[PDB]
Structure 1
Amino acid sequence: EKNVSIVVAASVLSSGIGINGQLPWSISEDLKFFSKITNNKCDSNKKNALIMGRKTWDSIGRRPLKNRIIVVISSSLPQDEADPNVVVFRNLEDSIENLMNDDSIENIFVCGGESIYRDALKDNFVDRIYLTRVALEDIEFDTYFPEIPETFLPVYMSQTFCTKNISYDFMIFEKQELKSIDDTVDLLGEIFGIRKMGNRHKFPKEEIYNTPSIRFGREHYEFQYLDLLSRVLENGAYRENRTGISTYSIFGQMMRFDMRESFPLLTTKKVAIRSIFEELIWFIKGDTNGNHLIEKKVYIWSGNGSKEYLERIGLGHREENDLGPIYGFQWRHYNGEYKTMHDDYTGVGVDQLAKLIETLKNNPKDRRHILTAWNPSALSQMALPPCHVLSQYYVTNDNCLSCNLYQRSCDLGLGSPFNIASYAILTMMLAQVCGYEPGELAIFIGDAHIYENHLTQLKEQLSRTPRPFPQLKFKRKVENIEDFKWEDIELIGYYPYPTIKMDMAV
């Protein structure tokens, strides 16, 4: 009685694994994974058995795999004994004889095709599933991996990797069949109430924890966003704010995201990537004219830039969509005397973005690559104070550009998915203009909150198991950072869950 594991690489949506007797992709690192996972043994005097169907045995050229015993399931192949590393059985059930005897076999791996996968699960022989989810769907398949039965639960989901602009994951499914420290902490939590800080940071209940079966393997960095939602639903204090919509709030949180092998665009909800870009280039160009976003069919700043909103906050003399000195005016003209959105500001103020770019390539190990938007002198003139307040950038020794952002207030339903993708794109733009590669993205949050009208929507999003992050590549190398256009951005392999509508609080 030893372990039996399925190893498979299937597409993210339809679970396709083959086409015309071969794989529908060529991912070198996935083969190395297959090699290392099937050679993984504990006894040096034992080998692992790899069960596969005849057509898969043809796919690998009918040649043995080093340090392993291949078991071919076939009704016609001669039960040859010349090759000791290849053995043939007439059916899958009889081939599980590696359990009954043959103590020289330690582990068993089911590597075969659709036929072998389908009746290995139907016969209930499989204990574990090693799934490699590949983000390729608009191609043709003729061989599929069967649907994983409900008796299996995911226990691990790796970060998103990239090969030839193809995103892929690594997951482990398992079939469902110290205490003195946990008790001591519980007892101290009964004595001290909220005086024990752990009781103010309670672990999220299972009913609000995304994919709860993955306990020790939440490597996918979309969990950095989904677990923050769970922590707010668990510990968020009901609080009123300047809008009529109250929130559940906590203070002091952070999220990490990789940008080397993926792009942190959420997959549990379809995110409007075009509106994010058009706002970011709007900041970079130094623009505060709210109409230029509306002319490009981007209405995210309509609520905070209406005549009724501006008159209520004390800016009745301001034009309709004149947002005042905000992001992109403190970026390019810091401390510049603001007039209107129509005046010419070329020359006035401190151009932080230009000095940032010049410093990134002239003194990379400098510890002052800082871009700020919090200007106490201009706060009164703003339609809304900056939420992403200050950001720092860092050049690694292997010529990668990382980014840190402090966010004073974070709408986790709407602003946060935008902020994650926006500062990811900005770091990639700065990386290309400065001749670096994208690094990491960290977001430090002050008031992380959830508006009460987003509760049903965000709980729906928590019911969706994440998919691998997409890729984002630029089609051309610009000379100045302002020259980026939406046509220059290619979003490769993005298969999100359906969009979720959420109303913004004005």
Structure 2
Amino acid sequence: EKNVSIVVAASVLSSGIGINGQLPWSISEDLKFFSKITNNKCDSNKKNALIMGRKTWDSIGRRPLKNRIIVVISSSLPQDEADPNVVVFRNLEDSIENLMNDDSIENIFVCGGESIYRDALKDNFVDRIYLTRVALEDIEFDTYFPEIPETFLPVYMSQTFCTKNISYDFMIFEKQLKSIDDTVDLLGEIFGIRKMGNRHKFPKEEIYNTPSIRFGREHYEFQYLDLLSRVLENGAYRENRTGISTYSIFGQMMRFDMRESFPLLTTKKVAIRSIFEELIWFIKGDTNGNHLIEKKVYIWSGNGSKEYLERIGLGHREENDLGPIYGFQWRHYNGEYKTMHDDYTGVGVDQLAKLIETLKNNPKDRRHILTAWNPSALSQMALPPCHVLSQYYVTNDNCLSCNLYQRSCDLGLGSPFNIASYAILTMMLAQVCGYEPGELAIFIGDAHIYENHLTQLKEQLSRTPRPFPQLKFKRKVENIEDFKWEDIELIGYYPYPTIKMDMAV
């Protein structure tokens, strides 16, 4: 009685694993993972057994795998005894004799074959599942990994990795002291909200995304879903300037890798083009909302209407003249603002240009900072800056990381946009300055969920995350303002359906 694990690499949506007798992809790291997971053993005087079908045995050239024993399921292959590293059985059931006798076999791996997978899961021989989720779906398959039965639950989901612009994930499925916890519970019974742990309660299972993954929430999309869960658990019900009240907490953070993937949420289709258009609108220094409306981007329409402007005391302002906001403090900080039609070339401090110059002239400098919080101009703005401050860091291996402090975070609408936007901005700065993308950390003050999003976000929490996509630039620009939407290629983005959520004005 020992352990049996399926090892498979399947596509993310349709679970395709093969085409015309070979693999539909070439990922070296996935083969290295197969090797290390099938060689992983405890007793040096024992070997592991790798069960595979006959066509799979043909796929690997009919040659043995070093240090392991291959078990081929075939009804026609001659039961040869010459090779002690390869043995043939007439059916999968008889081949499980590695359990009964043969104490020199430590662990068993079901290594390939749609038929082998299917009748190993149907016969309930499988204890564990090592699944490599590959983000390739618009290709041809003829062999599929069967659907994982409900008796299995996921216990691990790795970060997204990238090979040849292909995103992939690693997941584990499993078939399914107290004294410290008791003392903490007693202290939390004695002290009420006086104990800070009671103010940061762990989210209940009903609001926790994929709860069976307890210790292996490595995929960095969990940094967003778990913040959603924390707000749902501990969020105080509070009113704000809009008619829609929120559930709010104060002081949170999220980390995202940008070396091996692009942090665009997969549990919901995100409008990446509107994000890019808003970001390039910021970079060019523009505050004219009509330039966004003309490009079919309407995210600033609510905060730039005649009624809203007259209500907040800017009735003199033109229709979509948002005032000195993001991109006017970026390029013309402390500049005397008049209208959106005037020429501001030369006035104010160009934070972006000085930032680029310092990033490529003094990388280890600790002052790479871009701010939008200008107390002298807050009254002239249609909306004070939400993503308030950002800092940039050049690693010793020439990667560019970004920190963002955001004073107020609409988790339903604003947060995915902010994640993708500052990811794109860090990538642009890295290309312009000759670096690679690093990490993205977002520090949040008032993180809140609007009450008219509760149905939506909870729905989003029911969807198990998929591996992040990749984002590449088609050309190397000479100035950061020259980026165009056609220059951006989004590779391997297979999200869940769109979740409509109304904005609070």
Which TM-score band (shorter chain)? over 0.9
Tell me the alpha carbon deviations over residues 90-135 of structure 1, each in whole angstroms, 9 at most, x when there is no partner. 0000000000010000000000210100000000000000000000
- Secondary structure in 2 aligned to 1:446? strand
Alpha-carbon distance between aligned partners in 1 of 2:469 and 2:63, rounded to the nearest angstrom: 36
Which residue of structure 1 aligns with residue 471 of structure 2? 472
What secondary structure sits across from 2:437 in the alignment?
A: strand
Cα distance between partner residues in 2 of 1:41 and 1:381: 67
Instruction: Quote how far apart the aligned CAs of 1:139 are.
Output: 0.1
Q: Deviations over 1:344-378 (max 9, x none)?
A: 00000000000000000000000000000000000
Matched residue SS, 1:64: coil
Q: Deviations over 1:15-62 (max 9, x none)?
A: 000000000000000000000000000000000000000000000000
Alpha-carbon separation, structure 1, partners of 2:163 and 2:77: 36
CA distance in 2, matches of 1:334, 1:113: 63
Root-mean-square deviation (CA), in Å?
0.2
Aligned-partner Cα distance in 2 for 1:309–1:374: 22
SS at structure 2 position matched to 1:226: helix
Match of 1:288 in 2: 287
Q: Distance in 1 between matches of 2:307 and 2:128?
A: 60
Deviations 1:133-176 (A, max 9, x none): 00000000000000000000000000000000000000000000
1:422 offset after TM fit, Å? 0.1
* 1:194 to partner: Cα distance: 0.2
Partner of 2:388: helix, strand, or coil? Answer: strand
Alignment deviations for residues 472-497 of structure 1 (CA, whole Å, 9 cap, x no partner): 00000000000000000000000000
Distance in 1 between residues matched to 2:324 and 2:196, nearest whole Å: 40
1:167-194 Cα shifts (integer Å, max 9, x gaps): 0000000000x10000000000000000
For structure 1, which runs of at least 5 residues remain unmatched after alignment? none
Is residue 42 of structure 1 aligned with residue 42 of structure 2? yes
- The 2-side partners of 1:143 and 1:424 are apart by 37
Q: Give the distance between the partners of 1:352 and 1:113, measured in 2 at CA.
A: 58
In the alignment, the residues of structure 1 paired with residue 195 and residue 370 of structure 2 have an alpha-carbon distance, to the nearest angstrom, of: 37
Instruction: Summarize deviations over 1:167-223 as a string: whole Å, max 9, x none.
Output: 0000000000x1000000000000000000000000000000000000000000000
CA apart distance, 1:289: 0.3
Q: Distance in 2 between matches of 1:187 and 1:276?
A: 48
- Tell me how far apart the structure 1 counterparts of residues 198 and 406 of structure 2 sit (CA, whole Å): 25
Report the TM-score when normalising by structure 2.
1.00
Report the secondary structure of 2:445's partner residue: strand
Deviation at 1:326, TM superposition (A): 0.1
- Which secondary structure state, in structure 2, belongs to the residue aligned with residue 116 of structure 1? helix
Q: In structure 2, what is the Cα distance between the partners aligned to 1:361 and 1:302?
A: 37
Cα distance between partner residues in 2 of 1:38 and 1:169: 18
Whole-angstrom CA distance in 1 between matches of 2:63 and 2:27: 20
The unaligned stretches of length 5 or more in structure 2 are none
CA distance in 1, matches of 2:97, 2:179: 43
Tell whether 2:413 aligns with 1:411: no
Aligned partners of 1:452 and 1:104: how far apart in 2? 60
Distance 1:487 1:57 in 2: 45
SS in 2 for 1:457: helix
The Cα shift of 1:442 comes to 0.2
Q: Per the alignment, in what secondary structure is the counterpart of residue 170 of structure 1? A: strand
Q: CA–CA distance in 1 between the matches of 2:490 and 2:57? A: 36
Q: Deviations over 1:303-325 (max 9, x none)?
A: 00000000000000000000000
